Amino acid sequence: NDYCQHFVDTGHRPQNFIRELIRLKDELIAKSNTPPMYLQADIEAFDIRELTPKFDVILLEPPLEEYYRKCWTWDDIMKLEIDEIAAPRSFIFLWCGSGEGLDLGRVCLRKWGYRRCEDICWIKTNKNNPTLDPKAVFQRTKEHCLMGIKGTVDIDLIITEEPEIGNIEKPVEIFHIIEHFCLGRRRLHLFGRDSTIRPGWLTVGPTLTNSNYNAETYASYFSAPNSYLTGCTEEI
Amino acid sequence: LFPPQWICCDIRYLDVSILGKFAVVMADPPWDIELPYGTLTDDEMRRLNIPVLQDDGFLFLWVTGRAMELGRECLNLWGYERVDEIIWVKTNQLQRIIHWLNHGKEHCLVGVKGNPQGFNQGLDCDVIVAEVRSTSHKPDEIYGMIERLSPGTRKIELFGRPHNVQPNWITLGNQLDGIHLLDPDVVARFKQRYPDGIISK
Numbered sequence: 001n002d003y004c005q006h007f008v009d010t011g012h013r014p015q016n017f018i019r020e021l022i023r024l025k026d027e028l029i030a031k032s033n034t035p036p037m038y039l040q041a042d043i044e045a046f047d048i049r050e051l052t053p054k055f056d057v058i059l060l061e062p063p064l065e066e067y068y069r070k071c072w073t074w075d076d077i078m079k080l081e082i083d084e085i086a087a088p089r090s091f092i093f094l095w096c097g098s099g100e101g102l103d104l105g106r107v108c109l110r111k112w113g114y115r116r117c118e119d120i121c122w123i124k125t126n127k128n129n130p131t132l133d134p135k136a137v138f139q140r141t142k143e144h145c146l147m148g149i150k151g152t153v154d155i156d157l158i159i160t161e162e163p164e165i166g167n168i169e170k171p172v173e174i175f176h177i178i179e180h181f182c183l184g185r186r187r188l189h190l191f192g193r194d195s196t197i198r199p200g201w202l203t204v205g206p207t208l209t210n211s212n213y214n215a216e217t218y219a220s221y222f223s224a225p226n227s228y229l230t231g232c233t234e235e236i
Numbered sequence: 237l238f239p240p241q242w243i244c245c246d247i248r249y250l251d252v253s254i255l256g257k258f259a260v261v262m263a264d265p266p267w268d269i270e271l272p273y274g275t276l277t278d279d280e281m282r283r284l285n286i287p288v289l290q291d292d293g294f295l296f297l298w299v300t301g302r303a304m305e306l307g308r309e310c311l312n313l314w315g316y317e318r319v320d321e322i323i324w325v326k327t328n329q330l331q332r333i334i335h336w337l338n339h340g341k342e343h344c345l346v347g348v349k350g351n352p353q354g355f356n357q358g359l360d361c362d363v364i365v366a367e368v369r370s371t372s373h374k375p376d377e378i379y380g381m382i383e384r385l386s387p388g389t390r391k392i393e394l395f396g397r398p399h400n401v402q403p404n405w406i407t408l409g410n411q412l413d414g415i416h417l418l419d420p421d422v423v424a425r426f427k428q429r430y431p432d433g434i435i436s437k
């Protein structure tokens with residue numbers, strides 16, 4: 001059976017036809033998680049260096065114009081000083097969209113000192129409703145989240161139904177993949193929202209309605225004996 | 237000439253200027269990324285005379301690992317802008333998905349050169365769901381997507397194998413069985429350039 005031909009015939013995307021416990025690890029993560037912390041900040045005007053300490057993981061979700069049938073261009077994104085807040089050994093997860101971001105996002109990762117080790121594709125089904133950028137050759141039915149590393153169970157796919165138009169949320173499954181890597185407990189989500197705040201994460205974005213961020217309180221979560229925990233180990 | 241054609245050759249050394257111009261180029265290169273096949277160095281890949289193969293059309297370039305980046309470099313060096321990226325989600329016969337993460341997909345960059353006119357852009361989507369028939373093989377769905385994109389035009393595949401030969405395609409690779417050319421324009425230029433039939437240096 002040829003699902004590409006089938007999509008041409010019917011409008012059903014090929015991904016519509018895709019069909020141990022690992023839960024105590026999820027409980028360890030839940031126990032090790034710091035309280036959720038969050039800060040309203042206009043990131044274009046805000047000095048990211050005020051965000052301390054340096055982070056083990058950064059999730060970067062700039063609002064791209066393609067997400068909308070204040071937008072951030074790749075010009076803006078590239079000029080963020082992410083390397084100033086990333087720990088010497090640390091990771092980045094950059095939502096790149098489906099167009100020029102797959103290239104410019106790679107320029108960014110290298111600009112900030114990372115190399116890409118994974119390309120995580122969010123594949124969007126249209127089971128419930130069987131655009132076209134001018135340069136597009138094909139209908140774009142996925143988004144890419146690039147994983148970068150600096151210094152020294154899951155699959156690289158996330159499958160969900162395409163969200164309603166104007167809904168720009170990314171699948172919460174991305175957090176599960178990140179937290180299952182056990183990369184450390186200083187986790188920053190840039191351009192998060194009230195709706196994405198999550199235990200174990202510091203969320204910073206322009207549309208947050210409330211803040212509770214305190215740099216000294218936040219650093220106190222990782223003071224000794226807890227400086228090097230992976231986030232998948234028992235409390236000390 | 238619509239029926240399949242192929243040239244057994246070392247693609248590093250073939251004079252590809254004899255083959256004419258193509259609406260679509262596809263390559264599945266043996267990138268140098270502990271492999272059961274011979275590879276091409278990054279420089280050999282960069283030096284491939286891709287630019288003579290098209291004036292206006294599309295390039296499909298399979299990439300994995302660090303060739304996701306090297307493939308982008310080559311694509312740009314050869315004069316293409318990357319405008320799409322197909323992924324093939326690998327399944328079994330029951331339609332279930334087969335370093336830091338397990339890998340459920342393969343990537344194919346789509347580049348454009350010039351200003352192609354009369355192509356059927358947007359008929360297919362950029363996700364392929366298909367069974368891994370044989371290991372190391374690419375999914376046959378890609379040929380159908382390319383045919384609907386550009387029906388009836390001449391196409392060329394680099395680093396293909398005998399199972400890849402297709403109507404409207406000329407296939408190049410060093411495990412093909414001899415030389416099989418039917419297009420009279422190509423036959424004429426091949427005899428001129430290779431009067432003794434040997435492709436060296």
Ligand SMILES: CNc1cc(N2CCC[C@@](O)(CNC(=O)c3ccc(CN4CCC(C)(C)CC4)cc3O)C2)ncn1
Nearest residue numbers: 246247264265266273274298372373374395409410411
């Ligand atoms: C030295 N100069 C040469 C060398 C040369 N080749 C070297 C020997 C082999 C061959 O003969 C045929 N190609 C392959 O077997 C071949 C196998 C596997 C792959 C990797 N893919 C990755 C993506 C995918 C999984 C969708 C599909 C697999 C690519 C290949 O290309 C081409 N051909 C002409 N000149």
